[PDB]
Symmetry: C4
Subunit: 354 residues, 4 copies
């Protein structure tokens, strides 16, 4: 009947994102240079740094995955290519000294065929990427892959609620990817009206996944290295970055001079440009440019450096302590203005602030 | 009694940019969801879109295009009674299409309604600035007593009491929206308004008891705002600025800075009132030319279908009854839009 | 330990935080009564007062304001003789109501005596901090010598300060610490109360004694005046919205083909000159708007629209029954015109 | 589970989130006392300390700050002999008070020995994270060797951190992690506390031991200083507001016809080289302001006006009695001047 308790709970929940909070410094006994940033995603997947490059056609291919793995991270080779081409990218990364590599797979009828070639190429993890992870199609596809490959690392997403996280874990997924709408090139929340603020989404999903011993991945919305520290402190084992990697030298594509500086193309996989590469349509992403940042090593050094400093401020020896003990404090828009530089004209741009 | 003095600053309101829709378990794909909606027995739409009854938005060509897309058009009342009845008759002659017409609360209101009924209009829109007026209530009772089977759309209102008053007067559809229009200054020049998402939610809460649908009119800037309006209790949304740049809109295309634009102004603006001193409650402006209506409608329905898919809603009734929101700050809004990226090209659904 | 734990308890609201809730209405906007009674000998046909500033109100402004049904406050940045002649000029042109600003100094009573001889209708004892012992002692001194004189005291922003001035003998209290468009008090001194909360807090106290309050400062559109009156104020005082009017002092200057007029705070460097100075105001310019009658028509028109939305037959009903709803910053962007390139200016929105 | 469920419970306020509520005042701004006592051997006529940065305070700045009634902290980006000569130069200029900054290294004890022999008045054991064991162990090592030396330890932003440094030997605590105008700690590390909540939380613990705190960073206008003192701080520390005066280190540059001075964070690349460093500061420029005396007069002038609004005859009354009121971003826009095109620059606003 009309006894709709859902009607009066429509506007009950509240959500927080990175710019809403700060990490509260605590007693510390460990220097930043001696903290442990290693993380374990499964029994056959350990990362020395908690950084994964996104599986997008302007972010990660073979050269990016090789450079990411040599930094201690992981690269997800995108799926906007043929099955044999993607397997050739995976095989190229594997032969380069026994490095880790991942590959993205869509939820289509041809998914099992693509996963077969990736497993034959000795892929370490597949990423069942989709816009709405909490669908029956993704759930059924996780179970079919789990039955065929019991020892394969499966990364499933994207989700933003605890119930969605529970459904993917009991379907076979050993890693859950969190993020509906936070991406720098994403318009899902604008054209569809759906999303969860990324920090609340990471906290709600990690709350459910910690009951089963499953890690979660913070995917999208990270603009500065401090946002990565907040995502890990909110419960995530590892973060996935797109915009902060699209400008590095190992990224696909060359440099074009724009506004007098070198720029690189960065576009969403749900944009018009990306969807036509693998084919009106209602897009959920945009196309654009990010500044050129030189080699990947210089960017990863700044990222890890900011994490080590933040863990020093919080007294975290390893990521598990930060995940379980770090406390936040909420601030208003005025607090954000105070957090950034203010009332001073910046002359030289810093390696970690633009 | 100091009850009214102590409750002045108690209520709180939310707009579209304050909230997001929470994803839920989904068994349906966006292309297999149903966007149909029923306002009454004699007024069913294939898509939940109504074009605003404004002189720069909807005339005969716009109403014909809206109906052939599955929606509805409201012929504006800034014309003679014979001209509005003739435009209604043109739309009906184009294949029995659904069409509406706007009527004010004046002395010639019944005369204009008499001519619109003879033209076989499908719905009368008694539109006024303050729907919670005694004159508006009396007019609805005067029309309902004369035409017991006529679809009467009354507005605009923004509170639960006003919704109950118009329903008890005879209105079978209620229009919600005081202030949120893109060309509206009512909240600025008069200080009166209710945040549109809270207004829709409060009016639908009262209207759902009596089985009366509400129209979310004004404030919609992207296709995601329409999803939030329907999820908040609205059966159908009304759009103005989203339809002004469409080729089927009345008025020719102007050239400004080489680009193509179309005039868009509020019915309470100075220019609109001089057509048919003054204290205006709207402004006059221009919007970019968007081309044929079919391209704009495709993007709007596509975002709605994607939104219903995220929420696991097969039909619009499930969205109204089950969709949950989450509140966010301004920082959440900035995260929701694209950010820290130099946009290269404009998207079809993101301007 | 109670004062230490209550430092951050209070919350405050301003005009852009709220909207008025429409209500059942049986009255058309052209039927409403905008009259207001400040005292037995001070009745206004419109709830509008022009601020006592040297770029807003002099003889010509006060004459035009009073003819529209309002009131003008002649500023005090002039000699006693010159201010007495300004007041007499307004009285000699039809017997119009007029007010005059007076500061708290040793010269205060001498200036008040000349204004009273000029048949001034209301003295505005305007100071930066109305909640001081010097201002209170001055109000008792003036009321003792002039029992029938209308005394407007300010500025204050708390219920405690409102009660102190009423018990001192003031019959009208002026509210506003910081919200002025040219004011920097909250920036340079860190002190203030959000104007809508200040009006409501002071009106809550003043209504117990049957004393009206003036909402002074922060009004940038006609809708802000409606909110201030609905929050408990009997009348509003405007500065920036009258500084561009032709009847204001100063000439019109043209900048990039558009006319402007000078507008500055009385605590700015320029006003007090007319290194050792620490100002609490800035100096700037506002667009030229032409005759006062056009601005007043838009102002009263916007008020009549708002009173119609609220079902207020008179200002006393709106003062006691109007309800607000709070909104965020996204609600403010929705309230203003948005996502449309504005082609031409409106007479009440620029 | 308790630590997991309390992650997002606390809420923090900054300067632009609140205003000071005006109260009854029997005291004029010119007759209030702005003196403060940090310890028995460190008393200041005005509550101003210039930051220990290579673009803010050296010998000339500390001399001018001391002659104005404040204190200057010699930065540590120089050899031990250079810093001792700078401290000695300030002492030779009429027995003026001077402070010196010291880092937490193995060289710290040797640097402190040379500063003590130069008759330094207070050392500033400054570091990025004052709530670490190395900073605690260093304070205890310095306190044991110099029981009468004024030790200012920081930086911190938590009551627990304040207690740890107090029990280690520090008689003055410096509050501030993030709010600096040139600081990017909160951006690149994600760590910080809104400055006004940090000052209030740390002063809450410090006052239970009779220990003063220093509000360090985030002050953009004179009103922010009044809020920091009213939040519980005995004295404020300024960097950006002092870097543009003549007495600060560096020389004047020209940019777009105006005069500027270089101002950079000590955690910036330029300050540390004086691509392996991960900086927590930026390099920039600030407009030239002239002699220090003109800036100090506007700062103290804002404090005297704010204390007059609050009815605080001394700084102790302001810390113990001043009440705040919270406001939204709309209230912040009302606080600043608005809807008026500013024509002239005020000596205390932009
Ligand atoms: C004012 C700032 C912020 C600043 C100034 C100059 C330079 C810095 C740099 C950029 C170097 N960043 C920094 O040192 N970050 C930091 C972060 C977290 C922690 Cl826990 C620590 N912990 C230890 O504290 C004790 C002492 O040994 C310190 O040297 C350090 O090793 C340090 C920053
Ligand atoms: C990263 C994003 C957002 C993105 C990337 C590339 C492309 C897209 C596009 C723009 C194509 N939009 C999208 O797919 N929208 C969407 C919306 C709502 C729902 Cl419920 C679904 N549901 C189904 O999920 C399971 C699987 O069947 C999927 O194929 C899908 O049909 C999809 C978006
Ligand atoms: C805001 C919109 C959409 C708008 C559109 C065109 C024009 C207007 C104008 C600018 C004319 N302003 C308006 O009419 N203001 C208004 C304010 C308050 C009240 Cl109470 C009323 N009451 C109505 O008076 C007339 C009659 O319809 C009565 O029945 C009653 O409803 C009207 C505004
Ligand atoms: C409208 C403003 C703000 C303004 C207008 C013109 C000039 C001013 C100036 C810039 C001069 N600042 C000012 O006076 N600041 C102020 C601050 C705090 C207090 Cl407590 C007081 N107390 C007053 O001392 C003198 C005496 O009148 C006392 O009775 C009492 O009123 C004054 C400001
Ligand atoms: O076009 C798209 N629409 C919505 N989300 C996208 C799209 N393309 C990439 N994403 C997401 O955004 C993430 C990277 O965004 P960023 O790191 O914040 O710039 C990816 O890992 C995806 O999860
Ligand atoms: O001038 C006016 N004043 C106030 N509201 C108006 C005016 N003109 C149109 N509207 C409203 O605004 C709606 C369209 O606004 P939009 O869809 O946001 O651009 C219309 O359907 C009316 O409800
Ligand atoms: O310089 C000043 N400092 C602080 N407040 C002022 C100053 N000058 C005028 N005001 C106040 O600001 C009001 C007008 O401001 P406005 O109408 O909002 O622009 C006046 O009536 C005074 O109450
Ligand atoms: O580079 C740095 N990183 C972080 N904080 C800094 C740095 N340099 C100075 N600070 C802090 O910022 C204060 C001055 O900043 P300001 O007065 O707000 O502009 C100093 O007293 C230090 O506490
Ligand atoms: K900062
Ligand atoms: K986004
Ligand atoms: K509007
Ligand atoms: K102001």
């Amino acid at each position: 009947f009309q006894s709709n308790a859902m009607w009066e709970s429509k506007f009950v929940k509240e959500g927080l994102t990175f710019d809403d909070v700060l990490l509260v410094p605590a007693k510390s006994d460990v220097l930043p240079r001696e903290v442990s940033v290693k993380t374990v995603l499964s029994e056959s997947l350990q990362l020395n740094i908690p950084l994964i490059s996104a599986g997008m056609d302007t972010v990660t291919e073979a050269d990016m995955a090789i450079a990411m793995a040599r930094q201690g991270g992981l690269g997800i080779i995108h799926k906007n290519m043929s099955i044999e081409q993607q397997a050739e990218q995976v095989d190229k990364v594997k032969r380069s000294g026994g490095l880790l590599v991942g590959a993205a797979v869509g939820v289509t009828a041809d998914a099992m065929t693509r996963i077969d070639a990736l497993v034959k190429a000795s892929v370490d993890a597949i990423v069942l990427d989709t816009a709405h992870g909490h669908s029956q199609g993704v759930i059924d596809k996780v179970k079919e892959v789990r039955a065929k490959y019991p020892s394969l690392n499966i990364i499933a997403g994207n989700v933003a609620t605890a119930e969605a996280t529970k459904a993917l874990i009991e379907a076979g997924a050993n890693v859950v990817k969190v993020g509906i709408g936070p991406g720098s090139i994403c318009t899902t929340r604008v054209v569809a009206g759906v999303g969860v603020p990324q920090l609340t989404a990471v906290y709600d999903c990690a709350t459910e996944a910690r009951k089963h011993g499953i890690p979660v991945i913070a995917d999208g919305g990270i603009k500065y290295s401090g946002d990565m520290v907040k995502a890990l402190a909110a419960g995530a084992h590892v973060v996935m970055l797109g915009s902060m990697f699209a400008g590095v030298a190992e990224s696909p594509g060359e440099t074009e001079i724009y506004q007098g500086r070198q720029f690189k193309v960065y576009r969403g996989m749900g944009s018009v440009g990306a969807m036509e590469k693998g084919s009106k349509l209602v897009p959920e992403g945009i196309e654009g440019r990010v500044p050129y940042k030189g080699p990947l090593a210089d960017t990863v050094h700044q990222l890890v450096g900011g994490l080590r400093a933040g863990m020093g401020y919080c007294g975290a020896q390893d990521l598990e302590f930060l995940r379980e003990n770090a406390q936040f404090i909420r601030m208003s828009g005025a607090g954000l203005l105070e957090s950034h530089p203010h009332h001073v004209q910046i002359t030289k741009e810093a390696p970690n602030y633009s």
